[PDB]
Amino acid sequence: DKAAVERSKMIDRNLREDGEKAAREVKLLLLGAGESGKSTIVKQMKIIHEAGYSEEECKQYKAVVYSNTIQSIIAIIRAMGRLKIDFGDAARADDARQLFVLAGAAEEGFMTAELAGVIKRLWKDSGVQACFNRSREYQLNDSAAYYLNDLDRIAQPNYIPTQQDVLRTRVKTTGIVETHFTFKDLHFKMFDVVTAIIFCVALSDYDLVMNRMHESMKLFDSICNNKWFTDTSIILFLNKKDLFEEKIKKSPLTICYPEYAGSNTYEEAAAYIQCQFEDLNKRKDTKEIYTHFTCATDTKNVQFVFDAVTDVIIKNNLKDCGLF
Numbered sequence: 001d002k003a004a005v006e007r008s009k010m011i012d013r014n015l016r017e018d019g020e021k022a023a024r025e026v027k028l029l030l031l032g033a034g035e036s037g038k039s040t041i042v043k044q045m046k047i048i049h050e051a052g053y054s055e056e057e058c059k060q061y062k063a064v065v066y067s068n069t070i071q072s073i074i075a076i077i078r079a080m081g082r083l084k085i086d087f088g089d090a091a092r093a094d095d096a097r098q099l100f101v102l103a104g105a106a107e108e109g110f111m112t113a114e115l116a117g118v119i120k121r122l123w124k125d126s127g128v129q130a131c132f133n134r135s136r137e138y139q140l141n142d143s144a145a146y147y148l149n150d151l152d153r154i155a156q157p158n159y160i161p162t163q164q165d166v167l168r169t170r171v172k173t174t175g176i177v178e179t180h181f182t183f184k185d186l187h188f189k190m191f192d193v194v195t196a197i198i199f200c201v202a203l204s205d206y207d208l209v210m211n212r213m214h215e216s217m218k219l220f221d222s223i224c225n226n227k228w229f230t231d232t233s234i235i236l237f238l239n240k241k242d243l244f245e246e247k248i249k250k251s252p253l254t255i256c257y258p259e260y261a262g263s264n265t266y267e268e269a270a271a272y273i274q275c276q277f278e279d280l281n282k283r284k285d286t287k288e289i290y291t292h293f294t295c296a297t298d299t300k301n302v303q304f305v306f307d308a309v310t311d312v313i314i315k316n317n318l319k320d321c322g323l324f
């Protein structure tokens, strides 16, 4: 392999008494707007390069799953109010009150057969479903349908959160987070605030109504064009491709990019965006952008993508990576 050959030509470890035992280091900065997948990528490195999340570990995310599920339904229900959507059947209006009763009597997340029923009944409602369907009009968790559609499982008294349940979580993170993991004998120090940068973009934020997509481009623009990053490999993750795919079906790219004239198909719309971002590169002859369409919650896609991102690093940056 080319990266194999590429690695094989280094001679620096011969300069270290016991160099074949040294740690070659890769410093990787993870960037992108809020809620764009940075934390999910951090979790996936654990899942893929460590063990990630043990059932004991997943057990700790139970009240986070409950918490996320409760918030999601409450957000759709409160929205119907502002948007004026009726309940498909007005008996549901009582479950709506009960949701606030049960949620209102608690500090932290929980699930009860009673709460489980109220939420299921509401979720199955057509009017609620109609409001759900207008999610671009209000703030709603991306994992909402994920969690809501799997309530019973989640509702089970002896429920243990799966790795996917854990990856689907929205957890409030503050501070810099630093993860160390080894892959292909490279020791990565990854910082979710430099050898490479992975910039995440939530593709589905396009129809959300400055514009979200445009604030991300705004930031990408500055990032890749920064002098500090001149020798850093700029990787662009056009993430949430899974939510974008279903969304582009009924929503139009023009909501985001009004001048867009291509077909509103996943192919043309996603291609358009990639072009929009890479177009920001002010040194196109000097710098290349490595774009990947990702689903951060899909461990296989990330494994795939990361393997690829990794070979680019070896081929472009190994020489600047120090031995420790």
Ligand SMILES: Nc1nc2c(ncn2[C@@H]2O[C@H](COP(=O)(O)OP(=O)(O)O)[C@@H](O)[C@H]2O)c(=O)[nH]1
Residues within 6 Å of the ligand: 032, 033, 034, 035, 036, 037, 038, 039, 040, 041, 142, 143, 167, 168, 169, 170, 171, 200, 239, 240, 241, 242, 243, 294, 295, 296, 297
């Ligand atoms: N379906 C889907 N959800 C995702 C994707 N990446 C992140 N999420 C969900 O979006 C939410 C926010 O992602 P997170 O990593 O916390 O974003 P950060 O704020 O950039 O760290 C979490 O619930 C994720 O599980 C993706 O590609 N697809």
